[PDB]
Amino acid sequence: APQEMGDENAEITEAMMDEANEKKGAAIDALNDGELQKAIDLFTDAIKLNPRLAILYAKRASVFVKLQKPNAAIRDCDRAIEINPDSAQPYKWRGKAHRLLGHWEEAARDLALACKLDY
């Protein structure tokens, strides 16, 4: 079953960008507490409010990996890469999710990229 990805063609106000950072702060607080479902919900709220911020999809992917929902992670990473092809985070989580699945060649591809992109 698939997760909410948010409307890619939305008009995004300064107000919405701010509330998104608020939901992100709370998602991060839940994550660090090991309340992982809660973290997903809160990243999902963040994504509906700023669906063009790549870091939000990457963070949610990382949570999906900790929950061992690798396909869900891969969907989030693809979307983050499509917004920002040159940032390291989504390749890392996509590589890790590919490992759970035993997609060894894909995982090494992505993890190799993550290492180079990271600086």
> Structural domain boundaries of the chain?
1-119
> Resolution of the experimental model in angstroms, please?
2.6
Distance CA 9, CA 11 (A): 7
Distance CA 98, CA 90 (A): 12
Residue 33 tokens read as 């507490």
Which candidate, 82, 64, 83, places its Cα nearest to that of 73? 64
User: 100 phi and psi, to 5 degrees?
Assistant: -50, -40
Experimental technique, in short, is: X-ray
DSSP codes, 41-74: HHHHHHHHH-TT-HHHHHHHHHHHHHTT-HHHHH
Helix (DSSP H) and strand (DSSP E) numbers for the chain = 6, 0
The CATH fold of domain 1-119: 1.25.40
Residue 119 tokens read as 């600086």
Distance CA 60, CA 75 (A): 10
